[PDB]
Write a protein that binds this ligand. Structure first.
Ligand SMILES: [Zn+2]
Length: 99
RNA sequence: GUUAAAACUCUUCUCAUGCUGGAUUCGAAAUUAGGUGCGCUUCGCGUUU
């Protein structure tokens, strides 16, 4: 609308962290060095998915609260488009407000 | 057996020139490389005063 909420999130690891590498060429290049490479950018910086953990977190607690929420984790699921997690993170036609 | 018969309105000359299917609209919306696996096994801080 007229405003936009910018939430700057700084995350500090309180234990080891592993996000696995998704790129085929980076995994096949590292297969003789490490059997579980970490997802890194090509600027040599660690890249963690953030949308999808936020969505899973909100879906589990809003399902526990009893407020209406669909499951976008079940296989080939279709987001309902009416729940609040479909508003923030997206549905098939309305898209996520929370970029 | 027609004031007859006989004599091809013929030859030559490009519908050509000038004008852009252009304008408007994002392949992107939905999907966490996740799940499983204990740096463990072996070696007395001896000896020497
Ligand atoms: Zn929904």
């Amino acid at each position: 609308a007229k405003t936009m909420k910018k939430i700057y999130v700084t995350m500090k690891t309180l234990s080891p962290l592993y996000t696995g590498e998704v790129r085929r060429e980076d995994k096949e290049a590292a297969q003789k060095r490490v059997n579980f490479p970490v997802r890194k950018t090509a600027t040599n910086k660690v890249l963690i998915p953030f949308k999808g953990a936020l969505r899973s977190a909100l879906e589990i607690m809003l399902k526990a609260k009893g407020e209406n929420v669909c499951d976008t984790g079940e296989s080939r699921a279709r987001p309902c488009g009416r729940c609040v997690t479909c508003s923030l993170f997206g549905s098939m036609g309305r898209a996520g407000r929370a970029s």
